[PDB]
Amino acid sequence: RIPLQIVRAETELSAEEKAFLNAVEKGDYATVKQALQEAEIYYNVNINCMDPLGRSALLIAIENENLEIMELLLNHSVYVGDALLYAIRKEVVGAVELLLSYQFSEFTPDITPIMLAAHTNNYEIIKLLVQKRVTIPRPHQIRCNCVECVSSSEVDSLRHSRSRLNIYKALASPSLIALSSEDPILTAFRLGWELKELSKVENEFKAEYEELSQQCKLFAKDLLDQARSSRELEIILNHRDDLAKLKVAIKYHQKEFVAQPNCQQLLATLWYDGFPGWRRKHWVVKLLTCMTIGFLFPMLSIAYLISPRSNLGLFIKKPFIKFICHTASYLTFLFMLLLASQHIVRTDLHVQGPPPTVVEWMILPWVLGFIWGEIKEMWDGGFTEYIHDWWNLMDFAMNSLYLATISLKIVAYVKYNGSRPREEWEMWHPTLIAEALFAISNILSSLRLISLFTANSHLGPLQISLGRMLLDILKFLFIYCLVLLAFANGLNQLYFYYETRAIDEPNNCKGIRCEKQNNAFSTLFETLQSLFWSVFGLLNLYVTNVKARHEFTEFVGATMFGTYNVISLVVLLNMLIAMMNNSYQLIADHADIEWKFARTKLWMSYFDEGGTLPPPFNIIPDSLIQNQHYQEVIRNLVKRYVAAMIRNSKTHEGLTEENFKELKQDISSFRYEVL
Amino acid sequence: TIPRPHQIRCNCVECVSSSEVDSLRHSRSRLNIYKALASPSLIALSSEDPILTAF
Amino acid sequence: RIPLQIVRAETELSAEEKAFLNAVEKGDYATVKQALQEAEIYYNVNINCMDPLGRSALLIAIENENLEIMELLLNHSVYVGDALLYAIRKEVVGAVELLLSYQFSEFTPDITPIMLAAHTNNYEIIKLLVQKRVTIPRPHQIRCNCVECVSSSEVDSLRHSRSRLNIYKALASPSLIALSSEDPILTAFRLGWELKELSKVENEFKAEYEELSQQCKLFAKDLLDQARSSRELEIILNHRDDLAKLKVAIKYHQKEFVAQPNCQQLLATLWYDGFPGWRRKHWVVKLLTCMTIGFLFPMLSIAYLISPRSNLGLFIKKPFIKFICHTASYLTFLFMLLLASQHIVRTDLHVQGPPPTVVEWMILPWVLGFIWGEIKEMWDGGFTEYIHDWWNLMDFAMNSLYLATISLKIVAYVKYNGSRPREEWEMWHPTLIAEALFAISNILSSLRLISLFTANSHLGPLQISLGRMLLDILKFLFIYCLVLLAFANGLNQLYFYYETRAIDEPNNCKGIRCEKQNNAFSTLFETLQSLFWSVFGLLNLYVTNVKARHEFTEFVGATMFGTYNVISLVVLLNMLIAMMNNSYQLIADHADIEWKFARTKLWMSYFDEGGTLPPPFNIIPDSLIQNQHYQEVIRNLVKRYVAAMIRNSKTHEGLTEENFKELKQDISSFRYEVL
Numbered sequence A, C: 001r002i003p004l005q006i007v008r009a010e011t012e013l014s015a016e017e018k019a020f021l022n023a024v025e026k027g028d029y030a031t032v033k034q035a036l037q038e039a040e041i042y043y044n045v046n047i048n049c050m051d052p053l054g055r056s057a058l059l060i061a062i063e064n065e066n067l068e069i070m071e072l073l074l075n076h077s078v079y080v081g082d083a084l085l086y087a088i089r090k091e092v093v094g095a096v097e098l099l100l101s102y103q104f105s106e107f108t109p110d111i112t113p114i115m116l117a118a119h120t121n122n123y124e125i126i127k128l129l130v131q132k133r134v135t136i137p138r139p140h141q142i143r144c145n146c147v148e149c150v151s152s153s154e155v156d157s158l159r160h161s162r163s164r165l166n167i168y169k170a171l172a173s174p175s176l177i178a179l180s181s182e183d184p185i186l187t188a189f190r191l192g193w194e195l196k197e198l199s200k201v202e203n204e205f206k207a208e209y210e211e212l213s214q215q216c217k218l219f220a221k222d223l224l225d226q227a228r229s230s231r232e233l234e235i236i237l238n239h240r241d242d243l244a245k246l247k248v249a250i251k252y253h254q255k256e257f258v259a260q261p262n263c264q265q266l267l268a269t270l271w272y273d274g275f276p277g278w279r280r281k282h283w284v285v286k287l288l289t290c291m292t293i294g295f296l297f298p299m300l301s302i303a304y305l306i307s308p309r310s311n312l313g314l315f316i317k318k319p320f321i322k323f324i325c326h327t328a329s330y331l332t333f334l335f336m337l338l339l340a341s342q343h344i345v346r347t348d349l350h351v352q353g354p355p356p357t358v359v360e361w362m363i364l365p366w367v368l369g370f371i372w373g374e375i376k377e378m379w380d381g382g383f384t385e386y387i388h389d390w391w392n393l394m395d396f397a398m399n400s401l402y403l404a405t406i407s408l409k410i411v412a413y414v415k416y417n418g419s420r421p422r423e424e425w426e427m428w429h430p431t432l433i434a435e436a437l438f439a440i441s442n443i444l445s446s447l448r449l450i451s452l453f454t455a456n457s458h459l460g461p462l463q464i465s466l467g468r469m470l471l472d473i474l475k476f477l478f479i480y481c482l483v484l485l486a487f488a489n490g491l492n493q494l495y496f497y498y499e500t501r502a503i504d505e506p507n508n509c510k511g512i513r514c515e516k517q518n519n520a521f522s523t524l525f526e527t528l529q530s531l532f533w534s535v536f537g538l539l540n541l542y543v544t545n546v547k548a549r550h551e552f553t554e555f556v557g558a559t560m561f562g563t564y565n566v567i568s569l570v571v572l573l574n575m576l577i578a579m580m581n582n583s584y585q586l587i588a589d590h591a592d593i594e595w596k597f598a599r600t601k602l603w604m605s606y607f608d609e610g611g612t613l614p615p616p617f618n619i620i621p622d623s624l625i626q627n628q629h630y631q632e633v634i635r636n637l638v639k640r641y642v643a644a645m646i647r648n649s650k651t652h653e654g655l656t657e658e659n660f661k662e663l664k665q666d667i668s669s670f671r672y673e674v675l
Numbered sequence B: 001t002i003p004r005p006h007q008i009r010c011n012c013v014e015c016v017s018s019s020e021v022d023s024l025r026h027s028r029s030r031l032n033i034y035k036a037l038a039s040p041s042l043i044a045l046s047s048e049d050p051i052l053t054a055f
């Protein structure tokens, strides 16, 4: 028996106010008029009476979209505050125009009429409001130590965050950008960048800021989509405040703008400069032409040096031929790196400091060219973006290992004279370190070729997904390294008392890299190595067996080894499978825009004159007219976009409501004509 | 008023006998009562602490 | 310049027919009347004129849902054939009633009005048609060699298939089952079973028949869902043409009907017969009670034998206690099987024919009980469903291996007298075969416990998914066995010339089960074994190396081994991963209905009196009233279902169309009143 009563009692109005509110809601030109006259004379009705469910007389008159009752209430001095916002949110032009011609609320007090109009994204209401000289407060910069931001955040943090989000939502509407900004493309780019960088700062309101940034990027892409000619697209892309706006969009990570089909057409025509209709030809003749131009890599580079402006000197200046020549030079470098480890060119293996062979003497200009190119990349173009590549770390590692190999070879040549057999050299002979670093640099140089996958149409998205899933490999190795450190600590602590010597063990071998694996858990480094190698099954089971008859210690060690194997394989590897499968499933939707953005960024790196020579040969010693043309193009694009959007806003629901309103008005007019 | 649903673990006669005589009607009545009590409007009107009532 | 003309010219009517058709379409009581009078007198208008887009005057009058023009056209002798079907498909009651009161077509000639009414599933139209004494032709049985089916399929197969599908779609409508059938539950069960079995026969029209079977099953479940009392549910489930209708639904594989919550309540109350509120208690006290009743398994079975109808004799007759006693007896059997291979009970290991030990003497009554229970299961209950279990094959294998072990032990006892050490016994000594078959039967008996997973709430759907993915394991092993046979044939053909002898090889071992693996590909059986064991990495790499210096043969053999490893692991295992992941994703939706059906089928196997004793102790020596009650229950359920369905058929579209029709009729009536 649960008793049910209204615990929050609302002060109900008198019966005289109910008649006035019912006359307002039903709609009557005479009953409301005489009710207001009686309220003026006898004071029977409070004019500012309000329903318990937040509905004043003016709000109900707005909800009925009738202008006569609204005009009479406006002339009868009804409380008009917080009533234009309801008409704006209802999105009716007549009521907003009438209220602009002159307690409880459903809107937060920081909302202005222009802000709500921008939130509702109605073109006519926003235009009619901005004609009345309205302004929006400027949101502050993200990192503020000023008093006006810090004190406001300290006093009322929720109101501050709500006000900032409301302002940024008002500024990000496509209609307000199309009306109030003279450069909607650059405004959309900038607002998308600020909203994306601000979503990470305000990590709790991340979804709304990400949605607003996506809205701005979509508006920029849709504004570019309305181009009806190649001249308009060339004017858009070449506008400088060669392809300036495309470089700006690449800077602001506008992947949807970059991967637009007409932008990709213009980039493809600029890429195949010397080949009219490269996509037209057969794949066999394309492969033959690519092979010929690649095999002509000593050519077209000497000709550039001896005659830059000849018939043949301008052949390498085209971007595709430049890319082919660079790829051919790198493949030739890797071929000589393969040839450097062969018996035909490498002899006299028992000298402490050897002079370089012919293959290494040929390798040296390539290494100097790579070093000089990476040095020039630090200066030319800039330094703040050189580290913002994530491929230049690999190049820096390659060049550092090359320099270390060269320096160690020089030291071993100048301080070691004579010959000595290789078995009696010391552990840290400079020659051995040089041969190790050269091999590591060979691995890095041959793995550098993955960056060329974005040019191909089939290996590009594959490399994009490879990066996507390496981002989760990086997360998985933290848990794996914690588990590895835990079990290594435990196993070394259990097993370090039974450490033997290399002399006692057979073949003078102490470690897990022997025929009979010895001292697998004796030291912490060897324990880490053993627990790493047990993942691939290369650690045998008898390494947990000690010389003495300590069967309890052996059993506890084998149990630790089995628990580590279970945790590190059965749980963790299949967890990694599930993680990468989920990440691949998410990225497979947006996998072609990313590849097209990466391919575009690779294409614009070959457009400029800098770095024309391959690394073998790169070490051998009025604005008003453009602004007005862009302004006409923007005017046409904005008009086309606003027309397409304004009738794409026509909806079955709104059309149906409009038809009922027109039918009701016409029936009432016909009834008044008959009566 | 709405009848109060019993506690989950009842050995009382009024619950056990009702479940024995007609189990389907008993389960339907309990589910209907708990569906009536869980509506947001009834919590907003009849309860003075809607947050704790919802919890 | 592609010329565009109408290649299929349609004979357009004269301008006099256009006026008549426009007057019919617009709606005019006077223009159509005078047009028909002029057509009667001057023969200016053909009354049966037809639009090019398949629209006669009567069809347009049907589309306008106006009965006056339809009545005048009916009185004016307009061609009425193939016009009731349009009114039925449009689903308007008045036009169908009026046309029932008296070239090109959009309907196939095998469609009758009752069949189209059943296809549209409108209750009022189906009722109004079945009141007029209509019949539906009976579809034939699935396997017909009769002339009337074979000749019709030979002359016109497409028409025959379309007619059969149309008839079965008309018979499967819920409204026709609710009206024309006195037992809608049994009719829905039977029709669902025939449609499911006919979907596999007509493998091309499989989707439609499967959809119709699902529709019938959904109708049966929804008819059961309208029960408002436990008495009605007990009347439904106990109706015999104890739980008879539940057994019928289990026979017809009605998983949705079985897994209904009220059926599961009734089954759960019948299952926990001696425990009022088993789900109420704590899990600890539940485990303690289950452990006590299980450990009392010698008890409650001797008491059943000495006093079946005592206080304690009826305790095991309850289903849950019977299940607990059976599980305890099986676990005790497995415990003695574990004890049989221990040194405490097994001694004198060098006798050719041993007498049985005490553990095997205790095992023998259990084996005889299992054999007698499986023999009784063949006779009691039936034989045609004993093979339709897929668990009785395992039981038959266990009992056959048990019988073979007993017979071999008897033979080895009666023909081998004396003692001999185990190393000089022959390869096929009967004792060794007995010990092998006993171990295989031990493996099978301990793996038999998987069938008890459906009782638990967490391991049931897991076993359902295990069966789901074993169904794809079975598909994968065909490709794997084909690849294995191919590579085994190739490797044996390459390597059989270098076969050695066991004497020449070290330790007199010839095979891959030695310390040094020898002759891995010498014979076809050993090649199959080697290629099987290479999947788990237990085949070493030096088995591809021969004694002679035939490096080309060794290289080709190693290349075959590597290709087999790549195909059988990198492609095939990850393909199997993808297949089972997809199958698990599909079955994870319908994974709880399957488990509840399996748990119900396990529960009804303990309800009957047969097999009350555990296998240790099972070898020790008026219908009119029920029909009328069921008829009242069906009447109430059908009325509730048809009310719920008939206003669930109310839709925004139909209500909106009805409101426009009423508004148009009222406005026309008001205009006629004014005029």
Ligand SMILES: CC(C)CCC[C@@H](C)[C@H]1CC[C@H]2[C@@H]3CC=C4C[C@@H](OC(=O)CCC(=O)O)CC[C@]4(C)[C@H]3CC[C@]12C
Binding pocket: A327, A331, A449, A452, A453, A455, A456, A457, A459
């Ligand atoms: C499988 C083994 C033999 C590979 C050995 C390494 C190289 C010989 C391969 C690896 C990556 C390959 C590259 C991957 C992608 C491309 C881009 C591709 O670009 C185009 O097709 C041009 C048109 C466009 O840019 O879309 C031209 C071949 C090339 C340089 C490939 C040349 C050959 C490379 C360097």
Ligand SMILES: CC(C)CCC[C@@H](C)[C@H]1CC[C@H]2[C@@H]3CC=C4C[C@@H](OC(=O)CCC(=O)O)CC[C@]4(C)[C@H]3CC[C@]12C
Binding pocket: C327, C331, C449, C452, C453, C455, C456, C457, C459
């Ligand atoms: C992990 C190792 C130690 C398992 C060794 C084998 C047995 C000791 C296990 C395997 C399967 C188990 C069974 C799995 C499922 C069930 C059903 C379960 O049923 C209930 O909970 C009763 C209520 C209901 O029917 O829903 C009772 C325990 C039982 C028989 C389990 C008893 C113990 C079993 C036989």
Ligand SMILES: [Ca+2]
Binding pocket: A374, A377, A391, A392, A395
């Ligand atoms: Ca670089």
Ligand SMILES: [Ca+2]
Binding pocket: C374, C377, C391, C392, C395
């Ligand atoms: Ca059985």
Ligand SMILES: [Zn+2]
Binding pocket: A140, A141, A144, A145, A146, A148, A149
């Ligand atoms: Zn600030």
Ligand SMILES: [Zn+2]
Binding pocket: B006, B007, B010, B011, B012, B014, B015
């Ligand atoms: Zn109670």
Ligand SMILES: [Zn+2]
Binding pocket: C140, C141, C144, C145, C146, C148, C149
């Ligand atoms: Zn027939």
